Amino acid sequence: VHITLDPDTANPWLILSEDRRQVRLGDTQQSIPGNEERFDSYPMVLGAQHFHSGKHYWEVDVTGKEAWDLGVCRDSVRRKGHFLLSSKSGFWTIWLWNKQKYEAGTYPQTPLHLQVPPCQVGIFLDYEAGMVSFYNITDHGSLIYSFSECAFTGPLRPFFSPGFNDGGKNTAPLTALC
Numbered sequence: 001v002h003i004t005l006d007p008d009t010a011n012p013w014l015i016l017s018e019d020r021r022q023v024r025l026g027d028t029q030q031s032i033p034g035n036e037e038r039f040d041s042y043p044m045v046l047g048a049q050h051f052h053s054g055k056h057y058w059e060v061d062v063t064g065k066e067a068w069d070l071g072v073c074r075d076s077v078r079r080k081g082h083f084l085l086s087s088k089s090g091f092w093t094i095w096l097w098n099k100q101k102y103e104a105g106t107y108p109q110t111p112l113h114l115q116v117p118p119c120q121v122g123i124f125l126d127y128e129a130g131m132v133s134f135y136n137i138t139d140h141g142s143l144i145y146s147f148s149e150c151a152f153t154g155p156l157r158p159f160f161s162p163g164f165n166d167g168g169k170n171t172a173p174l175t176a177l178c
């Protein structure tokens with residue numbers, strides 16, 4: 001129930017808090033040991049938990065960030081090199097990036113029109129239903145987007161990115177909310 005970030009998966013540009021509930025962009029590619037699970041080309045990290053069934057929920061503070069990506073991914077997603085975050089490649093995510101532009105990771109991408117920019121985002125997974133939904137905590141829990149008919153067959157993982165290094169313009173953390 002209590003999501004924790006998995007240091008073995010974390011790109012070396014990421015700083016994880018000791019309690020593994022916060023991740024942020026660092027200023028220098030750290031010199032952490034290597035291992036097959038680590039995202040080597042993007043500032044990405046997984047939650048340690050693996051879901052095979054059930055409903056599951058977590059919540060992330062994004063206050064003060066100009067860019068981030070949140071969602072769920074297959075355990076089997078590739079870790080090394082470059083790739084696109086498509087449902088075919090095993091990703092169900094939403095993101096914030098450019099001039100305050102929110103998008104859902106469909107092909108083609110789906111612009112999301114959020115009158116109230118979220119300070120916290122809820123992520124709700126229902127394995128058996130094939131559903132991942134995103135809630136705008138700041139706008140009283142309004143539905144941002146839902147992926148349906150996901151037809152999961154393998155284990156799933158919480159997926160996070162605090163954005164891209166931009167010169168300290170995006171050092172605010174993602175924080176998992178109790």
Ligand SMILES: CSc1ccccc1-c1ccc(C(=O)N(C)CC2(F)CCCCC2)c(S(C)(=O)=O)c1
Nearest residue numbers: 042067068069084085086095105106107109161163
């Ligand atoms: C470090 S992740 C991050 C962190 C903060 C904000 C944004 C992102 C981020 C979102 C989507 C992509 C991506 O896959 N695309 C845009 C392609 C596509 F639209 C192609 C059509 C299917 C959906 C995905 C990428 S990426 C891997 O290209 O850098 C990065």
